[PDB]
């Protein structure tokens, strides 16, 4: 009986660690996905308000609300969990994005690795994804509050391409979450056998 118990306990300890690794990972991934959805919603609203703008004091008011959206998106781009920025890669000394869209985060991604070898990017350099999001929102807000109508059609298209960038990331992140959820279900089925 003792010999069998060595094997069952060894496996059970690997399973426990993997369960914690999956729980930790799903928290970072959920936060990431929720932040991305919050950005998608913001850019959607920015698009809508810019259509209104394209369709004197009132163009400026639209410009104002786009400014609130710019602030919300900068807040969202600076989301931090477990000591690191999810869109600021491997440095957390500074906020990774300014209100101007300048990136001051870490150059490299931070990888996490499950007990069984599976690796994913937990904290990423988000400059290419979010710097242009923010820069576009900023030019949108200024174009509107300065009554600059000619600038708006270009910026509408810029925001559409930026949003497609955020949608594709949301989808990649959804996929990683689905994988984690499959790993959990596999481990649960394996736990039942052991016990
Ligand atoms: Zn062991
Ligand atoms: Zn936390
Ligand atoms: Zn320091
Ligand atoms: Zn590796
Ligand atoms: Zn999901
Ligand atoms: Zn779950």
Residue numbers in the entry: 45 to 99, 104 to 243
What do the study authors state?
To initiate filament growth, three junction proteins, namely, FlgK (hook-associated protein 1), FlgL (hook-associated protein 3), and the cap protein FliD (hook-associated protein 2), are sequentially placed at the distal end of the hook. The FlgL and FlgK junction proteins that are located between the FlgE hook and the flagellin filament are indispensable for the formation of the flagellum because both FlgL-deficient bacteria and FlgK-deficient bacteria lack functional flagella and are immotile. The bcFlgL and xcFlgL structures revealed that the D1 domain of FlgL forms a four-segment structure, irrespective of the bacterial species.
The truncated bcFlgL and xcFlgL proteins adopt one-domain (D1) and two-domain (D1-D2) structures, respectively. The D1 domains of bcFlgL and xcFlgL are superimposable, with the same organization of four α-helices (α1-α4) and one β-hairpin (β3-β4 hairpin), although the β1-β2 hairpin is located in different positions. The D1 domains of FlgL and flagellin both contain a three-α-helix bundle and a β-hairpin, with a similar length for each segment.
